[PDB]
Design an enzyme around this catalytic site. Structure first.
Site, short mmCIF file in Angstrom:
data_model
loop_
_atom_site.label_atom_id
_atom_site.label_comp_id
_atom_site.label_asym_id
_atom_site.label_seq_id
_atom_site.Cartn_x
_atom_site.Cartn_y
_atom_site.Cartn_z
N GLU A 119 0.78 -1.22 0.00
CA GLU A 119 0.00 0.00 0.00
C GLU A 119 0.82 1.29 0.00
OE1 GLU A 119 -3.01 0.07 -0.36
OE2 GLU A 119 -3.72 -1.94 0.16
N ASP A 140 -6.54 6.53 -4.89
CA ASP A 140 -6.04 5.21 -5.01
C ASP A 140 -6.06 4.77 -6.50
OD1 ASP A 140 -8.57 4.27 -5.44
OD2 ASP A 140 -8.72 3.04 -3.68
#
Ligand SMILES: [Cl-]
Ligand SMILES: [Cl-]
Length: 162
Positions: free
Chosen positions: A11, A20
């Site tokens: 991540e 994202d």
């Protein structure tokens, strides 16, 4: 290696609101803020999560604090899920980490959707599950991360991450 290190690799860490891979507002270590297109809405959710007026920026400790909560919630979500728990219970430590990763990323509902691969994992048919897992939007959209998770399931080792 462990789940935290694994997910911190997948991540990354960003201290300012970002989008994202799906274009959603996120912050920290993959902490989704909102699926809404509005940055204000994102900022509002952020402040409420942190508990202060942040203006879209948090510190490293704040990020790690959301991260601890999110990992904890993922584990607990697996344990409460009728479809997931048994899979998890059946696996070794390494592979349990692979399942937590997927849940952190796509949610329990999403993972519970891989019904066939789940049965195969429970049966310890590694190679077959890996092939099945690859036939998914998940793999097509984030192939490198998916490949790492899938090798972990296939091998039961952390090699993909070393
Ligand atoms: Cl929260
Ligand atoms: Cl990727």
């Amino acid at each position: 290696m462990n789940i935290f290190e694994m997910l911190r690799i997948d991540e990354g860490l960003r201290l300012k609101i970002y989008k994202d891979t799906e274009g959603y507002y996120t912050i920290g270590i993959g902490h989704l803020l909102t699926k809404s297109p509005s940055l204000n809405a994102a900022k509002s959710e952020l402040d409420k999560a942190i508990g202060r007026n942040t203006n879209g920026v948090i510190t490293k400790d704040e990020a790690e604090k959301l991260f601890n909560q999110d990992v904890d919630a993922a584990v607990r979500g697996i344990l409460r899920n009728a479809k997931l728990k048994p899979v998890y219970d059946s696996l070794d430590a390494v592979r349990r980490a692979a399942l937590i990763n997927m849940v952190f990323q796509m949610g329990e509902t999403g993972v519970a959707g891989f019904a066939n691969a789940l049965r195969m994992l429970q049966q310890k048919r590694w190679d077959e599950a890996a092939v099945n897992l690859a036939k998914s939007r998940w793999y097509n959209q984030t192939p490198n991360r998916a490949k790492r998770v899938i090798t972990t399931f296939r091998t039961g080792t952390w090699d993909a991450y070393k």
